[PDB]
């Protein structure tokens, strides 16, 4: 036994109290404008950089069949010139503040944000409001982007995982708004115009659905003044056309189903199996986070996969069942998705499928306390890593105000995580997994993937 | 054309780009620890404040002098690919002389 | 060392070597047919007797002037392997001068 | 069906009368010096290059266990200077001729030949006699050559087919002179000196055991005058050391046996199956040549192996049983070897061995007239291709004089080949192959090569 090299550390998983980390974590201030727009900041005391942007409770879910793809086309168009600044003027002004603009468009969330330095907060606010409110939406730029999107559609230029997940959302959420892709079909792109973009932005980009979230080096009062000057002219929302009324009017539906996308000369075999999960507001979403940490993820560039804490990672790494896999926990406003996605080939696809199904059903019966303590510690450590980057702080502020209605404090989040034990994991796994319908999606070399009855049979055990 | 002179707006833009890169490298704790370790190993000290002061206190004349001294020094030239079109090597390293 | 001058014994040795290769390449029936075809395709006629007579009639002055006129043209340098001792690309072209 | 393209050619094999070829073939003129040395020349009517050299009826068979490898060391040492020419003088004299010197040491035959033009025959005779009769055999050059030979012994630097055929000779002709290798063991190389070389040269390089053969652009009587001037100091026979008496004193013996040389990490498997063949003087050696043509050979660089007229080539090319193979027919003074050598993998060793054994045993029952006619035409055409090259004509003259005691006219060789029919092939295969012991040698990845009893049982058919 080494005296200095063997103290302080041991492989026995024990619960860790993260309470002393809460003393120095910063506070979030929220101000609601008369427009209905919330302004939320989180000042890190010695930060030199700032992430700030606009988060919108809108996306591909709130479109129709006629204009499906308008929100994704908007991030192609919006940066191509405004009514006060040209393309080159915007490029020069963004270059001089030393940052980059960025945009994401989800099924239910959209953000446009800037990662700048602390001296360029007001300039970033002005630029973001300028693209958001006074865009040109020129027909020539629309025609210049339509052909590029049509070429990349004809080439089938897509990631494999995004292809599988789009098939999974399409077959699990049949005949509901969440089954549409963000990109949209080919015909809507072939018949897009400026009027649909104007109507979408006029309908959905309103005051109660928009959060201006800034993290890093930022003062709250100055951002309040700048937001009231710039974003003060956004329309308010009718009570009859709120987000909740649209959610009630077109609800999500989960259907147990199966799809594969077969190719004649492919090499890989990507596959995802998901169960109907929890919405964002379900209190069972925290145990689903812990269970997703318990399942974990692995890719074959790591060599310590056989010494993993997770039994699924151990099985896949030891037997070589997949080149990479990951467990996912997707949450929406009124439903969710929980499952495992992986990449394999056609000779290891059935054994990988069996490993996924056997490890999912095993959590209903046998869960040991060491795994739960390990996963709680890993999830709390992962939450502390997001606090290190101001981009993740701003993203979490925007997401939490949009989908929870409030900024969940870190003490409440640690207390809600620490209340999860093995009985809770068994109960949540019994509720969501055991003898339930699932959704199966695959793409590539999928001739040896088992059909739906094989997957349906392995959601329960006949021996207990 | 860089050796022919930089014009104010380009100098300010490049200084802001360099400052943004320098400050975004040390924004997170692992990046800051890596920067401190590499600077202490290479020099014996960490001087990010002095690097920022040097970036901000740079004039266009100093940059033009720097590029002028650079182009006098012999360069390094590397090509790649299924090379089926190339000017001769002697005339390649002549345009800076 | 070749351009400065070739001795009569060295010229006789090289002429005998070249004549031996030329008359060995056409000694077999397939080699003779291949030489006939290659010569008619390239130049329109085949006569290795004229080639042999030109080899026999070469003097040291002809070879010395040929190499002197050959060194007055562009060289060509090609290197294979790992080049950890490639001295200079420009200077080796100027060694012939 | 093109009229100009589908005349004069058809794939049905028919006998071809090669008689009109012999009118233009040159004749051989043989003289005998008083010491017993023969000079034989064949004058090609329009030639410029000439090859010439000394063929000696000696080799590693006629050594003892104390001096094994003296004959191969002779061709290492004989070109390092003479009593009249130094190293550099010999080099400039050879390179002034515009030609090559080459030597080949076998088991029963040694050659020292040159390839020059027609104007340098006399200089070649002078330099050949000077090399052969007046060599220095310096001890310093012997010590320099021994280090090179020993280093390549300890690195194990050898061709794989050479290793297999040496093992096959050492196990097939065990306790016989023909069982030794030409290069010799490590101890004899390490303990060799000038006196063993001198005694070997004085004992075996006598008058009637040497033949001076030249072919191409050469005059007979002028070469006789040069040969009498140069090779006149060669001693004559002692009656107790003639070739026939040495053959009678130490004859050859064939034993059915097995050997393999297993390596731990080897990609390839090389195996040879050989039967006791015929000697040079055996009248059944001509049907063995026809049978060697019938079996044929193949390598995987040929893409038309499946269309071959040989059944063994058909099976090996169609089924992919080997990478390359070739049937051989070795003849010696009193014995010989006959069989198939091939290069394959460990997973195809048994199938390749069964293909070899089944194609050999089938020739005792099933021989078609078309395959015999085709192989006879191929044999005669291959004999005519050797006539095109001066080197092969000179080698043919020297070998035929050394092993038959005469020069066989091409008319007699054609008449002997033309007398072989399917009945003769059946009878020769029944004499040499059917229910006989064989010798099997292997090297490399040979763990799946069958043992001797597997090979021995497949020399006969119980079905008949
Ligand atoms: C009805 C009662 C069955 C019962 O109690 O099942 C408990 C027991 C436990 O099953 P489970 O854990 O719920 O599900 C199987 C696993 O998912 C593990 O399943 P798997 O994906 O590893 O494949 C196992 C597969 C294949 O199992 C095998 O190894 C082959 C089984 C051969 C049985 C068929 C022979 C028929 C008669 C010929 C003699 O078994 C089946 O096809 C299902 C049971 C076969 C009956 O099921 C059996 O294995 C049945 C035993 C056989 C007696 C019937
Ligand atoms: Zn898109
Ligand atoms: Zn050797």
PDB file of N, CA, C and O in Angstrom, chain D residues 378-418:
ATOM      1  N   UNK D 378       1.489 -29.151 -78.129  1.00  0.00           N
ATOM      2  CA  UNK D 378       2.068 -28.172 -77.212  1.00  0.00           C
ATOM      3  C   UNK D 378       3.529 -28.482 -76.907  1.00  0.00           C
ATOM      4  O   UNK D 378       4.354 -27.570 -76.820  1.00  0.00           O
ATOM      5  N   UNK D 379       3.862 -29.770 -76.751  1.00  0.00           N
ATOM      6  CA  UNK D 379       5.244 -30.180 -76.517  1.00  0.00           C
ATOM      7  C   UNK D 379       6.146 -29.851 -77.695  1.00  0.00           C
ATOM      8  O   UNK D 379       7.247 -29.320 -77.510  1.00  0.00           O
ATOM      9  N   UNK D 380       5.699 -30.155 -78.913  1.00  0.00           N
ATOM     10  CA  UNK D 380       6.526 -29.871 -80.081  1.00  0.00           C
ATOM     11  C   UNK D 380       6.670 -28.371 -80.311  1.00  0.00           C
ATOM     12  O   UNK D 380       7.747 -27.897 -80.693  1.00  0.00           O
ATOM     13  N   UNK D 381       5.607 -27.603 -80.048  1.00  0.00           N
ATOM     14  CA  UNK D 381       5.700 -26.153 -80.162  1.00  0.00           C
ATOM     15  C   UNK D 381       6.631 -25.561 -79.109  1.00  0.00           C
ATOM     16  O   UNK D 381       7.357 -24.603 -79.390  1.00  0.00           O
ATOM     17  N   UNK D 382       6.626 -26.118 -77.895  1.00  0.00           N
ATOM     18  CA  UNK D 382       7.556 -25.658 -76.870  1.00  0.00           C
ATOM     19  C   UNK D 382       8.990 -26.028 -77.219  1.00  0.00           C
ATOM     20  O   UNK D 382       9.925 -25.295 -76.882  1.00  0.00           O
ATOM     21  N   UNK D 383       9.177 -27.166 -77.889  1.00  0.00           N
ATOM     22  CA  UNK D 383      10.503 -27.535 -78.368  1.00  0.00           C
ATOM     23  C   UNK D 383      10.982 -26.590 -79.457  1.00  0.00           C
ATOM     24  O   UNK D 383      12.180 -26.302 -79.543  1.00  0.00           O
ATOM     25  N   UNK D 384      10.067 -26.095 -80.293  1.00  0.00           N
ATOM     26  CA  UNK D 384      10.449 -25.138 -81.325  1.00  0.00           C
ATOM     27  C   UNK D 384      10.725 -23.753 -80.755  1.00  0.00           C
ATOM     28  O   UNK D 384      11.478 -22.981 -81.355  1.00  0.00           O
ATOM     29  N   UNK D 385      10.114 -23.408 -79.620  1.00  0.00           N
ATOM     30  CA  UNK D 385      10.388 -22.113 -79.004  1.00  0.00           C
ATOM     31  C   UNK D 385      11.773 -22.070 -78.375  1.00  0.00           C
ATOM     32  O   UNK D 385      12.353 -20.988 -78.234  1.00  0.00           O
ATOM     33  N   UNK D 386      12.311 -23.225 -77.978  1.00  0.00           N
ATOM     34  CA  UNK D 386      13.675 -23.265 -77.465  1.00  0.00           C
ATOM     35  C   UNK D 386      14.692 -23.076 -78.579  1.00  0.00           C
ATOM     36  O   UNK D 386      15.790 -22.571 -78.336  1.00  0.00           O
ATOM     37  N   UNK D 387      14.338 -23.465 -79.803  1.00  0.00           N
ATOM     38  CA  UNK D 387      15.200 -23.277 -80.961  1.00  0.00           C
ATOM     39  C   UNK D 387      15.346 -21.807 -81.346  1.00  0.00           C
ATOM     40  O   UNK D 387      16.314 -21.447 -82.021  1.00  0.00           O
ATOM     41  N   UNK D 388      14.421 -20.950 -80.917  1.00  0.00           N
ATOM     42  CA  UNK D 388      14.476 -19.536 -81.268  1.00  0.00           C
ATOM     43  C   UNK D 388      15.590 -18.794 -80.540  1.00  0.00           C
ATOM     44  O   UNK D 388      16.076 -17.777 -81.043  1.00  0.00           O
ATOM     45  N   UNK D 389      16.002 -19.270 -79.370  1.00  0.00           N
ATOM     46  CA  UNK D 389      16.988 -18.591 -78.541  1.00  0.00           C
ATOM     47  C   UNK D 389      18.323 -19.320 -78.596  1.00  0.00           C
ATOM     48  O   UNK D 389      18.367 -20.550 -78.526  1.00  0.00           O
ATOM     49  N   UNK D 390      19.413 -18.552 -78.718  1.00  0.00           N
ATOM     50  CA  UNK D 390      20.749 -19.145 -78.782  1.00  0.00           C
ATOM     51  C   UNK D 390      21.133 -19.797 -77.461  1.00  0.00           C
ATOM     52  O   UNK D 390      21.816 -20.829 -77.450  1.00  0.00           O
ATOM     53  N   UNK D 391      20.719 -19.197 -76.341  1.00  0.00           N
ATOM     54  CA  UNK D 391      21.061 -19.719 -75.021  1.00  0.00           C
ATOM     55  C   UNK D 391      20.445 -21.088 -74.789  1.00  0.00           C
ATOM     56  O   UNK D 391      21.106 -21.997 -74.274  1.00  0.00           O
ATOM     57  N   UNK D 392      19.190 -21.265 -75.200  1.00  0.00           N
ATOM     58  CA  UNK D 392      18.536 -22.557 -75.055  1.00  0.00           C
ATOM     59  C   UNK D 392      19.102 -23.593 -76.011  1.00  0.00           C
ATOM     60  O   UNK D 392      19.164 -24.772 -75.659  1.00  0.00           O
ATOM     61  N   UNK D 393      19.541 -23.181 -77.202  1.00  0.00           N
ATOM     62  CA  UNK D 393      20.158 -24.127 -78.130  1.00  0.00           C
ATOM     63  C   UNK D 393      21.503 -24.605 -77.591  1.00  0.00           C
ATOM     64  O   UNK D 393      21.813 -25.803 -77.639  1.00  0.00           O
ATOM     65  N   UNK D 394      22.306 -23.688 -77.041  1.00  0.00           N
ATOM     66  CA  UNK D 394      23.589 -24.066 -76.452  1.00  0.00           C
ATOM     67  C   UNK D 394      23.408 -24.955 -75.226  1.00  0.00           C
ATOM     68  O   UNK D 394      24.136 -25.945 -75.054  1.00  0.00           O
ATOM     69  N   UNK D 395      22.437 -24.623 -74.370  1.00  0.00           N
ATOM     70  CA  UNK D 395      22.150 -25.451 -73.204  1.00  0.00           C
ATOM     71  C   UNK D 395      21.649 -26.827 -73.618  1.00  0.00           C
ATOM     72  O   UNK D 395      22.006 -27.834 -72.998  1.00  0.00           O
ATOM     73  N   UNK D 396      20.833 -26.887 -74.674  1.00  0.00           N
ATOM     74  CA  UNK D 396      20.344 -28.158 -75.188  1.00  0.00           C
ATOM     75  C   UNK D 396      21.479 -29.015 -75.730  1.00  0.00           C
ATOM     76  O   UNK D 396      21.504 -30.228 -75.496  1.00  0.00           O
ATOM     77  N   UNK D 397      22.434 -28.400 -76.437  1.00  0.00           N
ATOM     78  CA  UNK D 397      23.575 -29.143 -76.974  1.00  0.00           C
ATOM     79  C   UNK D 397      24.412 -29.721 -75.840  1.00  0.00           C
ATOM     80  O   UNK D 397      24.724 -30.920 -75.824  1.00  0.00           O
ATOM     81  N   UNK D 398      24.747 -28.884 -74.854  1.00  0.00           N
ATOM     82  CA  UNK D 398      25.577 -29.344 -73.748  1.00  0.00           C
ATOM     83  C   UNK D 398      24.910 -30.417 -72.908  1.00  0.00           C
ATOM     84  O   UNK D 398      25.520 -31.444 -72.592  1.00  0.00           O
ATOM     85  N   UNK D 399      23.633 -30.213 -72.568  1.00  0.00           N
ATOM     86  CA  UNK D 399      22.905 -31.185 -71.761  1.00  0.00           C
ATOM     87  C   UNK D 399      22.699 -32.498 -72.507  1.00  0.00           C
ATOM     88  O   UNK D 399      22.894 -33.572 -71.928  1.00  0.00           O
ATOM     89  N   UNK D 400      22.321 -32.434 -73.789  1.00  0.00           N
ATOM     90  CA  UNK D 400      22.084 -33.650 -74.557  1.00  0.00           C
ATOM     91  C   UNK D 400      23.368 -34.440 -74.753  1.00  0.00           C
ATOM     92  O   UNK D 400      23.349 -35.674 -74.727  1.00  0.00           O
ATOM     93  N   UNK D 401      24.495 -33.749 -74.944  1.00  0.00           N
ATOM     94  CA  UNK D 401      25.764 -34.454 -75.062  1.00  0.00           C
ATOM     95  C   UNK D 401      26.179 -35.073 -73.735  1.00  0.00           C
ATOM     96  O   UNK D 401      26.724 -36.182 -73.710  1.00  0.00           O
ATOM     97  N   UNK D 402      25.901 -34.391 -72.621  1.00  0.00           N
ATOM     98  CA  UNK D 402      26.345 -34.902 -71.329  1.00  0.00           C
ATOM     99  C   UNK D 402      25.499 -36.079 -70.852  1.00  0.00           C
ATOM    100  O   UNK D 402      26.026 -37.003 -70.224  1.00  0.00           O
ATOM    101  N   UNK D 403      24.192 -36.076 -71.125  1.00  0.00           N
ATOM    102  CA  UNK D 403      23.322 -37.093 -70.537  1.00  0.00           C
ATOM    103  C   UNK D 403      22.910 -38.203 -71.505  1.00  0.00           C
ATOM    104  O   UNK D 403      22.464 -39.265 -71.047  1.00  0.00           O
ATOM    105  N   UNK D 404      23.038 -38.002 -72.815  1.00  0.00           N
ATOM    106  CA  UNK D 404      22.747 -39.061 -73.770  1.00  0.00           C
ATOM    107  C   UNK D 404      23.982 -39.584 -74.484  1.00  0.00           C
ATOM    108  O   UNK D 404      23.896 -40.622 -75.146  1.00  0.00           O
ATOM    109  N   UNK D 405      25.113 -38.891 -74.390  1.00  0.00           N
ATOM    110  CA  UNK D 405      26.287 -39.296 -75.128  1.00  0.00           C
ATOM    111  C   UNK D 405      26.250 -38.973 -76.601  1.00  0.00           C
ATOM    112  O   UNK D 405      27.134 -39.414 -77.340  1.00  0.00           O
ATOM    113  N   UNK D 406      25.256 -38.215 -77.051  1.00  0.00           N
ATOM    114  CA  UNK D 406      25.112 -37.856 -78.453  1.00  0.00           C
ATOM    115  C   UNK D 406      24.283 -36.582 -78.534  1.00  0.00           C
ATOM    116  O   UNK D 406      23.955 -35.962 -77.520  1.00  0.00           O
ATOM    117  N   UNK D 407      23.973 -36.178 -79.756  1.00  0.00           N
ATOM    118  CA  UNK D 407      23.075 -35.065 -80.031  1.00  0.00           C
ATOM    119  C   UNK D 407      21.894 -35.635 -80.801  1.00  0.00           C
ATOM    120  O   UNK D 407      22.056 -36.093 -81.935  1.00  0.00           O
ATOM    121  N   UNK D 408      20.718 -35.628 -80.185  1.00  0.00           N
ATOM    122  CA  UNK D 408      19.538 -36.209 -80.821  1.00  0.00           C
ATOM    123  C   UNK D 408      19.053 -35.263 -81.912  1.00  0.00           C
ATOM    124  O   UNK D 408      18.827 -34.075 -81.642  1.00  0.00           O
ATOM    125  N   UNK D 409      18.909 -35.734 -83.147  1.00  0.00           N
ATOM    126  CA  UNK D 409      18.317 -34.896 -84.192  1.00  0.00           C
ATOM    127  C   UNK D 409      16.863 -34.592 -83.880  1.00  0.00           C
ATOM    128  O   UNK D 409      16.173 -35.373 -83.220  1.00  0.00           O
ATOM    129  N   UNK D 410      16.403 -33.430 -84.352  1.00  0.00           N
ATOM    130  CA  UNK D 410      15.035 -33.008 -84.077  1.00  0.00           C
ATOM    131  C   UNK D 410      14.015 -33.907 -84.758  1.00  0.00           C
ATOM    132  O   UNK D 410      12.880 -34.026 -84.279  1.00  0.00           O
ATOM    133  N   UNK D 411      14.399 -34.545 -85.866  1.00  0.00           N
ATOM    134  CA  UNK D 411      13.522 -35.506 -86.518  1.00  0.00           C
ATOM    135  C   UNK D 411      13.265 -36.715 -85.629  1.00  0.00           C
ATOM    136  O   UNK D 411      12.135 -37.211 -85.560  1.00  0.00           O
ATOM    137  N   UNK D 412      14.296 -37.191 -84.928  1.00  0.00           N
ATOM    138  CA  UNK D 412      14.114 -38.329 -84.035  1.00  0.00           C
ATOM    139  C   UNK D 412      13.289 -37.956 -82.810  1.00  0.00           C
ATOM    140  O   UNK D 412      12.468 -38.754 -82.349  1.00  0.00           O
ATOM    141  N   UNK D 413      13.498 -36.757 -82.265  1.00  0.00           N
ATOM    142  CA  UNK D 413      12.693 -36.316 -81.131  1.00  0.00           C
ATOM    143  C   UNK D 413      11.230 -36.154 -81.524  1.00  0.00           C
ATOM    144  O   UNK D 413      10.330 -36.538 -80.766  1.00  0.00           O
ATOM    145  N   UNK D 414      10.976 -35.625 -82.726  1.00  0.00           N
ATOM    146  CA  UNK D 414       9.607 -35.511 -83.213  1.00  0.00           C
ATOM    147  C   UNK D 414       8.988 -36.881 -83.462  1.00  0.00           C
ATOM    148  O   UNK D 414       7.803 -37.081 -83.185  1.00  0.00           O
ATOM    149  N   UNK D 415       9.766 -37.836 -83.980  1.00  0.00           N
ATOM    150  CA  UNK D 415       9.229 -39.174 -84.225  1.00  0.00           C
ATOM    151  C   UNK D 415       8.951 -39.913 -82.922  1.00  0.00           C
ATOM    152  O   UNK D 415       8.002 -40.699 -82.841  1.00  0.00           O
ATOM    153  N   UNK D 416       9.778 -39.686 -81.902  1.00  0.00           N
ATOM    154  CA  UNK D 416       9.533 -40.273 -80.591  1.00  0.00           C
ATOM    155  C   UNK D 416       8.300 -39.670 -79.932  1.00  0.00           C
ATOM    156  O   UNK D 416       7.516 -40.390 -79.306  1.00  0.00           O
ATOM    157  N   UNK D 417       8.123 -38.351 -80.046  1.00  0.00           N
ATOM    158  CA  UNK D 417       6.945 -37.709 -79.470  1.00  0.00           C
ATOM    159  C   UNK D 417       5.687 -38.151 -80.207  1.00  0.00           C
ATOM    160  O   UNK D 417       4.663 -38.460 -79.588  1.00  0.00           O
ATOM    161  N   UNK D 418       5.764 -38.258 -81.532  1.00  0.00           N
ATOM    162  CA  UNK D 418       4.629 -38.633 -82.361  1.00  0.00           C
ATOM    163  C   UNK D 418       4.211 -40.089 -82.194  1.00  0.00           C
ATOM    164  O   UNK D 418       3.143 -40.462 -82.688  1.00  0.00           O
TER     165      UNK D 418
END
